[PDB]
Design a protein around this nucleic acid. Structure first.
Ligand code: SF4
Ligand SMILES: [Mg+2]
Ligand SMILES: [Mg+2]
Ligand SMILES: [Mg+2]
Ligand SMILES: [Mg+2]
Ligand SMILES: [Mg+2]
Ligand SMILES: [Mg+2]
Ligand SMILES: [Mg+2]
Ligand SMILES: [Mg+2]
Ligand SMILES: [Mg+2]
Ligand SMILES: [Mg+2]
Ligand SMILES: [Mg+2]
Ligand SMILES: [Mg+2]
Ligand SMILES: [Mg+2]
Ligand SMILES: [Mg+2]
Ligand SMILES: [Mg+2]
Ligand SMILES: [Mg+2]
Ligand SMILES: [Mg+2]
Ligand SMILES: [Mg+2]
Ligand SMILES: [Mg+2]
Ligand SMILES: [Mg+2]
Ligand SMILES: [Mg+2]
Ligand SMILES: [Mg+2]
Ligand SMILES: [Mg+2]
Ligand SMILES: [Mg+2]
Ligand SMILES: [Mg+2]
Ligand SMILES: [Mg+2]
Ligand SMILES: [Mg+2]
Ligand SMILES: [Mg+2]
Ligand SMILES: [Mg+2]
Ligand SMILES: [Mg+2]
Ligand SMILES: [Mg+2]
Ligand SMILES: [Mg+2]
Ligand SMILES: [Mg+2]
Ligand SMILES: [Mg+2]
Ligand SMILES: [Mg+2]
Ligand SMILES: [Mg+2]
Ligand SMILES: [Mg+2]
Ligand SMILES: [Mg+2]
Ligand SMILES: [Mg+2]
Ligand SMILES: [Mg+2]
Ligand SMILES: [Mg+2]
Ligand SMILES: [Mg+2]
Ligand SMILES: [Mg+2]
Ligand SMILES: [Mg+2]
Ligand SMILES: [Mg+2]
Ligand SMILES: [Mg+2]
Ligand SMILES: [Mg+2]
Ligand SMILES: [Mg+2]
Ligand SMILES: [Mg+2]
Ligand SMILES: [Mg+2]
Ligand SMILES: [Mg+2]
Ligand SMILES: [Mg+2]
Ligand SMILES: [Mg+2]
Ligand SMILES: [Mg+2]
Ligand SMILES: [Mg+2]
Ligand SMILES: [Mg+2]
Ligand SMILES: [Mg+2]
Ligand SMILES: [Mg+2]
Ligand SMILES: [Mg+2]
Ligand SMILES: [Mg+2]
Ligand SMILES: [Mg+2]
Ligand SMILES: [Mg+2]
Ligand SMILES: [Mg+2]
Ligand SMILES: [Mg+2]
Ligand SMILES: [Mg+2]
Ligand SMILES: [Mg+2]
Ligand SMILES: [Mg+2]
Ligand SMILES: [Mg+2]
Ligand SMILES: [Mg+2]
Ligand SMILES: [Mg+2]
Ligand SMILES: [Mg+2]
Ligand SMILES: [Mg+2]
Ligand SMILES: [Mg+2]
Ligand SMILES: [Mg+2]
Ligand SMILES: [Mg+2]
Ligand SMILES: [Mg+2]
Ligand SMILES: [Mg+2]
Ligand SMILES: [Mg+2]
Ligand SMILES: [Mg+2]
Ligand SMILES: [Mg+2]
Ligand SMILES: [Mg+2]
Ligand SMILES: [Mg+2]
Ligand SMILES: [Mg+2]
Ligand SMILES: [Mg+2]
Ligand SMILES: [Mg+2]
Ligand SMILES: [Mg+2]
Ligand SMILES: [Mg+2]
Ligand SMILES: [Mg+2]
Ligand SMILES: [Mg+2]
Ligand SMILES: [Mg+2]
Ligand SMILES: [Mg+2]
Ligand SMILES: [Mg+2]
Ligand SMILES: [Mg+2]
Ligand SMILES: [Mg+2]
Ligand SMILES: [Mg+2]
Ligand SMILES: [Mg+2]
Ligand SMILES: [Mg+2]
Ligand SMILES: [Mg+2]
Ligand SMILES: [Mg+2]
Ligand SMILES: [Mg+2]
Ligand SMILES: [Mg+2]
Ligand SMILES: [Mg+2]
Ligand SMILES: [Mg+2]
Ligand SMILES: [Mg+2]
Ligand SMILES: [Mg+2]
Ligand SMILES: [Mg+2]
Ligand SMILES: [Mg+2]
Ligand SMILES: [Mg+2]
Ligand SMILES: [Mg+2]
Ligand SMILES: [Mg+2]
Ligand SMILES: [Mg+2]
Ligand SMILES: [Mg+2]
Lengths: 96, 82, 208, 137, 99, 122
RNA sequence: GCUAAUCCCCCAUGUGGACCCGCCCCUUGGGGUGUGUCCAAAGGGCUUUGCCCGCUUCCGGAUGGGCCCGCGUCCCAUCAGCUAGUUGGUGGGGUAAUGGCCCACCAAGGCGACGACGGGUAGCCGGUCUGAGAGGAUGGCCGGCCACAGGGGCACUGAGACACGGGCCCCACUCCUACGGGAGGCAGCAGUUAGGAAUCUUCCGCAAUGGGCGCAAGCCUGACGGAGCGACGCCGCUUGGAGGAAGAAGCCCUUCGGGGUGUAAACUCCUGAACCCGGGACGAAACCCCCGACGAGGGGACUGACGGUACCGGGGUAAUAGCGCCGGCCAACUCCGUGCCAGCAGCCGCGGUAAUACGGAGGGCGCGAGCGUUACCCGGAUUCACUGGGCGUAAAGGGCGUGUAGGCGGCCUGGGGCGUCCCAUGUGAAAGACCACGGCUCAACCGUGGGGGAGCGUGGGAUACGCUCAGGCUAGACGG
RNA sequence: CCGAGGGUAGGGCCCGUGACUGGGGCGAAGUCGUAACAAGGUAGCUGUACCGGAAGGUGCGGCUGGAU
């Protein structure tokens, strides 16, 4: 009337927890970076973008983001940010 | 992983294995990649074993894993002779 | 299994002597030599022209009733001969001949195939050494058909070997008397046997 | 006219049923190649390029059997049978290995191939297939 | 190899995309006779260079949109409106096949 | 037809119509008898043929023939049926199997007992 | 409320990899490079300055998958028009990745008699059954793929699932309680029940093969290896064999003289299925231990569910036959009884007092632990006719024109080479089939080998015919 | 936001069934007449129209598959 599959279920709930926690912070920071990048604030834009970029690849180390997802996410982050800064500018740090 | 093992043919109380390379996740008598020899445990014929030792070493080279009771039939067939 | 019944009624229907008994066949107490007419209430009534079908039924039944064999195994052999290369008639006749119970009766080990079966069936026969009790075994060229020594010292085999001193046995067969052992040399050509059967008509029976 | 080739074969077939010495068909460099095979294989005495009212024709000299005994003194044919295989309605193509033996060997299948007009025999010889023109015996 | 077909552009009413009608022959499996069958492909034309009536080649490609799995290879011929007519008239006839 | 006519319309594969619809694919079907009576046959015959109305497990209710001399069939009798018309009895498309359920075998059969569901006498 | 790690996070290092910008090669997002930026890791065990299992990051291989395309895949046209995420574009979202898969906007398109849309039926194939072949029918078992896990939806964890014996939610149903509340998912192996014409043991075993975990011992394995049941099928075998009357009784027939069953029986000899006793497997040598170097190699041992079965050896009893048919097709004939009755019946047709046609008997025919029936498939059916049919009167020319699409098209010469034909080459899994041999005492079954083809991808080749483009002709056609 | 589904409302296709009713098939030993087959006793058949217990009759035009 029970197995260790119940055990396997329990583990999933904790990993989901840790997963959601990282992915939200990414989206929160990525947009935060994008936010600043429009109203640049060129230094602050690049400053945040690094912390997002970091959290992206650090989530990629685990089961959070697949290698290509992190790469996919980062490619879209930088591209949006830089072109946001191409209006006004200019990129105060790195980068880059 | 990719493996080299025995897929039973023959019939009831009439064993007859084919040594073969196929996915470990396959069903044992399932579709295989390539046959590389045969074997008769009941020894009812002059050559109840034979192995393409040339081929059996190719897969082994690339990461195929033999069963324990296949390693026997591969050593005896002189694949492990250095 | 096989026919296992009154065997003289067969010959009387066939209009031919089928030598199915051994000894009695040659005596004037034979069924045919006393009554050459069909078994039953109407055997003396004047026969009407047998249909095309009737003719081919008889010839097949004849060739089959000779070997005391079941219609299935008869059919299956014919089919095997129907697939196999060459003149179907020859291969069929040869295959019918290559049966162990027949080879046993041919080399004269027995008086009748009917008796030749029980000899095979009761282990009294062997081939190339090993014992065989299977009346259907497919005799090949090179097969050494012998009596088992544990059956060598028996009356019925002796009496029947005591007749096989000088009787000649077909161009496809050899024999060592006293030692109670012979050999199958080759597959009988149609010439080798003169069976009262137009075997062409047998093919034509099955082509319906 | 819709099938020039068939018309010829029909002109021949019809003409032989009344045992004409010859008969005329409208000319073509392809009808000739066929007629060539027809003559060499011995179906016709031969042909020659004539003109009718200034228009090109092929005259075909017909070959028959000997005078015969009985109520019907009409001789046998040399061409008993000739008819289209491939048609405009349906193009019949055969590879070499599937080329039919006309009348167990006694007749020929004229064929148009990428190596000229050949018979069944010649096709297996040259080793090529093609559109099956007609069968004749 | 990536499959390449030749066909006539029968519509240029889309943006950056044309309809390429490709025809083909084959003997009928039972009846022998050579029969014609055609099929329309929507092809990607990034520059909108191709016109109505152009006989062109298309190569099978990575998906561009839905229904778009071919890019235009090269111009083969220009100005075959005679073929577009053959296509168009058949469509027009369909309004006389209803009830 | 022209070859072209064949390419367009093709040939028409004509289907076979079952002669035993109430069977609905099955070799035999169980039913219960509603009416058991006698019916006069059509020309050029003359008799009183034994017939049963049976309501099947296929939802159908068909008229069935009763083969053999004498029977123990009545209303509410459970019966099994098989195919085969009785030509001279229009509307009868099925035979009742003797020796099954409430259908006993024929008393005193000696010849052909399997078809009349009668055990072998000693 | 305490605590460990191969649990979790932070800094570092950067072989490398990830991203933006630039550039060289390439040509869809492929490879390299420079600047900026970003990213690692985990230890455990024994014989302990050395091994073993791990861990991290990156490149390649191999294997298993995702997605996309060409061609092929049933019935109804008494379904003829279908379509607003619809077709395409721009920009994002999303994924491992392409994509209207999703969103916003813009354009107004997309599909359809070469059958769209709608309805009906079906999981598809290797193959299987039949058939001379062509073709028809079919997809159980075995192998490949798909789909599903009471009915639906959804995501979580993960390399991989939107997961049969994991999770959430809604429904139906059922159950349990202490009436306060809760639980389940056999289309896993058995088994129950209902339905039905009908389809199995709540068996035995991890010894074998394969699988999961572990350094390993080993543990789990209703996969599987076997057993039980059911003539369901195929195959092998048995109920005996030799002798034995001008021929018992019994029964049938009869011209009353006789004919039949019938060498059949009886009886004589001979053999010895069953059974009783003795011995008793092939399947099992690996892992492991020993030495060697935990490798190469050599040597040692353990273990058998089936099973004391098969089988080998000794003894040894004459030991189950049934079913259908006997008018013609179609093989097998007589008597009695009934009297258009009872009944038979696949078709033709039988029975109304001389029935080889009903029922019984004798005799006969055919098969034989089977014989018959029903149902369905193909065949006979050249009766949907490609192979291989027809339309004056047999079923069948449209009442007649005109013409759309389509189908088909004269003679000559060139170019292309699409059809077409040839060669090379890849694929065409295995099993099945075909041929040969071999293993079970034969066969069925099974093993080893051999021959292949269609069909498609590829390269090369040919040009007669069909095609296409080009240039001519006048016989068709039209005009003066 | 979308969303299983539940609910309200109006459509479409199919199946089953229904007082009663239309003809159809078979049964057959009933009833009425005799339309068709011969020149079938008014040559027949035909499309159409009207009429009559019923086969049928008649008008109009058509066919010979009409005897003489
Ligand atoms: S005795 Fe032998 S031969 Fe004479 S009839 Fe009886 S069996 Fe036939
Ligand atoms: Mg666990
Ligand atoms: Mg937030
Ligand atoms: Mg995840
Ligand atoms: Mg990852
Ligand atoms: Mg193991
Ligand atoms: Mg048998
Ligand atoms: Mg003889
Ligand atoms: Mg032959
Ligand atoms: Mg002789
Ligand atoms: Mg046959
Ligand atoms: Mg033809
Ligand atoms: Mg796009
Ligand atoms: Mg009931
Ligand atoms: Mg009658
Ligand atoms: Mg029937
Ligand atoms: Mg009977
Ligand atoms: Mg600690
Ligand atoms: Mg760091
Ligand atoms: Mg470890
Ligand atoms: Mg996009
Ligand atoms: Mg969409
Ligand atoms: Mg929108
Ligand atoms: Mg708009
Ligand atoms: Mg199409
Ligand atoms: Mg259609
Ligand atoms: Mg449905
Ligand atoms: Mg189907
Ligand atoms: Mg279905
Ligand atoms: Mg045929
Ligand atoms: Mg089935
Ligand atoms: Mg399957
Ligand atoms: Mg579902
Ligand atoms: Mg579900
Ligand atoms: Mg559920
Ligand atoms: Mg269920
Ligand atoms: Mg995992
Ligand atoms: Mg995923
Ligand atoms: Mg679930
Ligand atoms: Mg699923
Ligand atoms: Mg379950
Ligand atoms: Mg599971
Ligand atoms: Mg309580
Ligand atoms: Mg709760
Ligand atoms: Mg339960
Ligand atoms: Mg079960
Ligand atoms: Mg059960
Ligand atoms: Mg039940
Ligand atoms: Mg029941
Ligand atoms: Mg079973
Ligand atoms: Mg195991
Ligand atoms: Mg392991
Ligand atoms: Mg367990
Ligand atoms: Mg178990
Ligand atoms: Mg059995
Ligand atoms: Mg006498
Ligand atoms: Mg006598
Ligand atoms: Mg007597
Ligand atoms: Mg007597
Ligand atoms: Mg006897
Ligand atoms: Mg062993
Ligand atoms: Mg072990
Ligand atoms: Mg060793
Ligand atoms: Mg014993
Ligand atoms: Mg013994
Ligand atoms: Mg004794
Ligand atoms: Mg006896
Ligand atoms: Mg019979
Ligand atoms: Mg009669
Ligand atoms: Mg007869
Ligand atoms: Mg009398
Ligand atoms: Mg009476
Ligand atoms: Mg009867
Ligand atoms: Mg009489
Ligand atoms: Mg009488
Ligand atoms: Mg009788
Ligand atoms: Mg009868
Ligand atoms: Mg049967
Ligand atoms: Mg049929
Ligand atoms: Mg046919
Ligand atoms: Mg035809
Ligand atoms: Mg006809
Ligand atoms: Mg005509
Ligand atoms: Mg006309
Ligand atoms: Mg009209
Ligand atoms: Mg035209
Ligand atoms: Mg044309
Ligand atoms: Mg032309
Ligand atoms: Mg040309
Ligand atoms: Mg070409
Ligand atoms: Mg194969
Ligand atoms: Mg053998
Ligand atoms: Mg093989
Ligand atoms: Mg072949
Ligand atoms: Mg090939
Ligand atoms: Mg040319
Ligand atoms: Mg020209
Ligand atoms: Mg002119
Ligand atoms: Mg003129
Ligand atoms: Mg909704
Ligand atoms: Mg709704
Ligand atoms: Mg609800
Ligand atoms: Mg009514
Ligand atoms: Mg009524
Ligand atoms: Mg009149
Ligand atoms: Mg009159
Ligand atoms: Mg009149
Ligand atoms: Mg009138
Ligand atoms: Mg009125
Ligand atoms: Mg009146
Ligand atoms: Mg009037
Ligand atoms: Mg008139
Ligand atoms: Mg007249």
């Amino acid at each position: 009337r029970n197995l260790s599959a119940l055990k396997r279920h329990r583990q999933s709930l904790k990993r989901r927890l840790r997963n959601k926690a990282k992915k939200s912070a990414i989206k929160t920071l990525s947009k935060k970076a994008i936010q600043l990048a429009q109203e640049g604030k060129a230094e602050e834009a690049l400053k945040i973008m690094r912390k997002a970029e970091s959290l992206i690849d650090k989530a990629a180390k685990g089961s959070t983001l697949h290698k290509n997802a992190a790469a996919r996410r980062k490619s879209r982050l930088m591209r949006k940010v830089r072109q946001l800064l191409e209006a006004a500018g200019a990129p105060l740090i790195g980068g880059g | 992983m990719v493996k080299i093992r025995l897929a039973r043919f023959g019939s009831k109380h009439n064993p007859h294995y084919r040594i073969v390379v196929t996915d470990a996740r396959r069903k044992r008598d399932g579709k295989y990649i390539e046959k590389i020899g045969y074997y008769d445990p009941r020894k009812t014929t002059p050559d109840w074993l034979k192995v393409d030792v040339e081929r059996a070493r190719y897969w082994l080279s690339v990461g195929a894993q033999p069963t324990d009771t296949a390693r026997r039939l591969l050593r005896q067939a002189g694949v492990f002779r250095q | 299994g096989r026919y296992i019944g009154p065997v003289c009624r067969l010959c009387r229907r066939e209009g031919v002597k089928l030598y199915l008994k051994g000894e009695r066949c040659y005596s004037p107490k034979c069924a045919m030599e006393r009554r050459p007419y069909p078994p039953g209430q109407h055997g003396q009534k004047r026969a009407r022209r047998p249909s095309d079908y009737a003719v081919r039924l008889r010839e097949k039944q004849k060739l089959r009733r000779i070997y005391g064999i079941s219609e299935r195994q008869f059919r299956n052999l014919f089919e095997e001969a129907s697939k196999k290369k060459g003149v179907t008639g020859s291969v069929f006749l040869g295959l019918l001949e290559s049966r162990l119970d027949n080879v046993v009766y041919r080399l004269g080990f027995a008086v009748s195939r009917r008796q030749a079966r029980q000899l095979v069936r009761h282990g009294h026969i062997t081939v190339n050494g090993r014992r065989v009790d299977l009346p259907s075994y497919r005799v090949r060229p090179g097969d050494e058909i012998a009596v088992a020594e544990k059956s060598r010292n028996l009356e019925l085999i002796r009496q029947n070997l005591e007749a096989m001193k000088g009787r000649k046995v077909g161009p496809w067969l050899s024999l060592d008397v006293e030692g109670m052992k012979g050999k199958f040399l080759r597959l009988p050509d149609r010439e080798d046997l003169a069976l009262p059967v137009n075997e062409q008509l047998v093919i034509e029976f099955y082509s319906r | 006219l819709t099938d020039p080739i068939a018309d010829m074969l029909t002109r021949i077939r019809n003409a032989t049923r009344v045992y004409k010495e010859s008969t005329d068909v409208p000319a073509s460099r392809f009808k000739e190649e066929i007629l060539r095979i027809l003559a060499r294989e011995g179906f016709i005495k031969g042909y020659e390029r004539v003109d009718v009212d200034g228009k090109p024709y092929l005259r075909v000299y017909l070959k028959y059997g000997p005078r015969r005994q009985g109520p019907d003194p009409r001789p046998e044919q040399v061409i008993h049978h000739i008819r289209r295989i491939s048609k405009p309605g349906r193009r019949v193509y055969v590879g070499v290995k599937e080329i039919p033996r006309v009348r167990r060997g006694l007749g020929i299948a004229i064929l148009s191939t990428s190596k000229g007009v050949l018979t069944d025999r010649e096709a297996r010889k040259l080793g090529v297939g093609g559109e099956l023109i007609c069968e004749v015996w | 190899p990536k499959k390449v077909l030749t066909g006539v552009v029968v519509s240029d009413k889309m943006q950056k995309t044309v309809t390429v009608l490709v025809e083909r022959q084959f003997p009928h499996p039972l009846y022998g006779k050579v029969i014609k069958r055609s099929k329309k492909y929507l092809a990607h034309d990034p520059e909108e260079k191709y016109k109505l009536g152009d006989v062109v080649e298309i190569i099978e490609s990575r998906p561009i949109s839905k229904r778009k799995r071919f890019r235009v290879l090269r111009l083969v011929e220009s100005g075959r409106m005679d073929l577009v007519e053959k296509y168009l008239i058949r469509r027009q006839n369909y309004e006389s096949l209803s009830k | 037809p022209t070859i072209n006519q064949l390419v367009r319309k093709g040939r028409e594969k004509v289907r076979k119509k079952s002669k035993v619809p109430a069977l609905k694919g099955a070799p035999f079907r169980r039913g219960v008898c509603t009416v058991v009576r006698t019916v006069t046959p059509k020309k050029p015959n003359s008799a009183l043929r034994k017939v049963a109305k049976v309501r099947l497990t296929s939802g159908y209710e068909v008229t069935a023939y009763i083969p053999g001399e004498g029977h123990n069939l009545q209303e509410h009798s459970v019966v099994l049926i098989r195919g085969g018309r009785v030509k001279d009895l229009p509307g009868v498309r099925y035979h009742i199997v003797r020796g099954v359920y409430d259908a006993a075998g024929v008393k005193d059969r000696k010849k052909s007992r399997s078809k009349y569901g009668t055990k072998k006498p000693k």
